[PDB]
Amino acid sequence: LECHNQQSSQTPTTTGCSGGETNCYKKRWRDHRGYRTERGCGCPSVKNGIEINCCTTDRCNN
Incomplete structure (x- = not known):
């Protein structure tokens, strides 16, 4: 079980x-700056309103 991390797109x-843990997830929102x-x-x-x-499933963060 391993997931990938990437901060906003970059690396x-x-x-x-x-x-x-045993699961992966992806969260995103826009605030302040905004993104x-x-x-x-x-x-x-x-949550509600944000993106989650x-x-x-094996590297499902993608």
């Missing part, structure tokens, strides 16, 4: 979650 990194995207491990949720996407 893609790799993150292994573990500890607990903020993050993709690390997790899957939780909640959970997936757990």
Whole structure:
């Protein structure tokens, strides 16, 4: 189980979650500046209005 991380588009990194986690997710929103995207491990949720996407299939963050 491993997901990739990349901060807003720029350089893609790799993150292994573990500890607990066993899932990957993608969240993004626009505030202040306005545009903020993050993709690390997790899957939780909640929100409304923002953009979120959970997936757990071998490198599903993409």
